[PDB]
Subunit: 116 residues, 4 copies
């Protein structure tokens, strides 16, 4: 449960369902290594991306595939994706919720970081 | 469960705890009648404001006491409160989540409306 | 001069044009007295609401008529209006910009207060 | 002319001044090639990044160095940077403003695309 992604739709007033999410981790050579991926559920949430063993310290990028989401709804949006880049677990394990609120030409994102 | 309020703190990356919330409903004479009130919990959520019987159609105002929240934290913020005003239940009962993301000089708010 | 309102549309990626904006000042009896109003321009801005002489310290409310905006574009929105309620304070910077970014079920607002 | 970046601070209610901004263009091999860069002005704006001739259709990334901004103000932030990735499209309006509103653990971004 150390990483969860929650996505909301500001046009519909609903969870953003079936949003693809790709997580990357910066490697020692400075490239972005694929780390985990998944899709938001009916409630706009994506659980089960990783484990506390696997989710070591590092710089992580959470790519939320907003264009793919809006295009699947037959809408032409502005952004390719929403990217959230952050250092994680560098003071020990934390739990991270990455939330995003989507519109066709805009988005908001926040983090909720909790210490278990 | 027809009305829930969720409040997040964009400075801390945490739920906004102990935020006072006052709900009003517009009366037939156009005044704002007190309807319900409460405080956010440790998880930034406020449940139990009303019931499906009580939460009839109307125009509702959810006042989130952001100044009181920031002042209790010893911070001087810009806004007096965040107000969310909406018509509810006019196509039959719905469930409403009013979410707000707070900063000292800014806030975001959204609604998630679901049909039970 | 001391107060400007700027409104943007997050669905179309544009200024929000021809949006009605009403400003009120809180009176001694806690009622909201009309203070100034207008409609946003082609750039989504509303200038000339007040003057330094008139814009004394106190609590003000800026009401942005978002519902009518969305309905005029053929879209059904959630809110009746967006409300921004704040205290004008002489000790802080002199010029207030109240900005709002609109979606059908959401809005963001910020204040940019400068000298 | 065709691209402007505007950055605001939601903690202080001000423009975000002296923020480094880097623009990249996606190359044919999917790498990000440096395109333009600068630091925001006293009004939080960065003008003069490119010209109409240079700003051809394609995918661009605007990276805003938010971490350094917050640290220079003595504040610990969440993100490494804020990223805005979009396609420039000739069929749409000609001028792009990329706006960002910053908090330590959050940001909002919008596009205002006009003629
Ligand atoms: C106004 C606004 C609201 C939200 C909502 C965030 C969250 C929301 C809405 C949320 C809702 C339900 C739940 O079980 C857990 C949740 O966790 C959240 O972080 C997120 C952003 C970025 C925003 O600008
Ligand atoms: C509530 C909120 C406000 C803004 C403000 C954007 C702009 C603002 C505030 C702006 C202000 C003055 C000006 O001369 C030009 C401007 O252009 C803008 O795009 C931008 C975001 C992302 C947001 O969430």
């Amino acid at each position: 449960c150390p990483l969860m992604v929650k996505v909301l739709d500001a046009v519909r007033g609903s969870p953003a369902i079936n949003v693809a999410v790709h997580v990357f981790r910066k490697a020692a050579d400075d490239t972005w290594e694929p780390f985990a991926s998944g899709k938001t559920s009916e409630s706009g949430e994506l659980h089960g991306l990783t484990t506390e063993e696997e989710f070591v310290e590092g710089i992580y990028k959470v790519e939320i595939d907003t264009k793919s989401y809006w295009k699947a709804l037959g809408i032409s949006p502005f952004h390719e994706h929403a990217e959230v880049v952050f250092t994680a677990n560098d003071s020990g394990p934390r739990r991270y919720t990455i939330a995003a609120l989507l519109s066709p030409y805009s988005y908001s994102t926040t983090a909720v970081v909790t210490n278990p």
